[PDB]
Design a protein that fits this description.
The structure is cut from a larger assembly and holds chains A (79 residues) and B (46 residues). Chain A is 84% helix and 0% strand. Chain A has one helix spanning 2-67. Chain A is rod-shaped and about 105 Å long. With 46 residues, chain B is mainly α. Chain B is built from two helices and no strands. The termini of chain B are far apart. Classes of the chains: A mainly alpha (79), B mainly alpha (46). Chain A binds chain B through residues 66, 69, 72, 74, and chain B through 37-41. Chain B: Belongs to the DASH complex SPC34 family. Chain B: It is found in: Nucleus; Cytoplasm, Cytoskeleton, Spindle; Chromosome, Centromere, Kinetochore. Chain B: This is DASH complex subunit SPC34.
Chain lengths: 79, 46
């Protein structure tokens, strides 16, 4: 009986530890959600610079087509 | 001597005036001096 009183005290300490672990795991997952948001923002910035490469790539090809002229209308696209 | 000097100067004259100096075989100038409707390049070779 008194030994079992000490046993339940051990279990009390264990439960306190477990509660802290549970709280920490919840906080961990919360941080993962926040992390995912920031990573999405990063990818957005990368997409922006991909747009920049699209600009210069079209520039280069447009010039090369004019530069490679070795033997029209004005219809273009103006968003 | 006499003809050597004459011939020397004539040689240099021929070699100098015959130098194919870069003529207006240029795009740049008209490209950004004649803002007109877009096309490839239209050197005003009139």
């Amino acid at each position: 009986s008194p030994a079992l009183l000490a046993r339940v005290n051990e279990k009390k300490a264990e439960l306190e530890n477990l509660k802290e672990l549970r709280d920490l795991s919840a906080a961990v997952a919360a941080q993962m959600e926040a992390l995912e948001q920031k990573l999405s923002t990063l990818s957005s910035g990368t997409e922006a610079i991909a747009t920049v490469l699209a600009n210069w790539h079209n520039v280069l090809r447009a010039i090369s087509m004019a530069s490679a002229k070795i033997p029209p209308q004005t219809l273009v696209r103006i968003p | 001597l006499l003809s050597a000097h004459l011939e020397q100067i004539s040689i240099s004259c021929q070699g100098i005036d015959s130098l194919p100096f870069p003529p207006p075989k240029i795009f740049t100038n008209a490209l950004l001096s004649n803002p007109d409707i877009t096309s490839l390049i239209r050197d005003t070779e009139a």
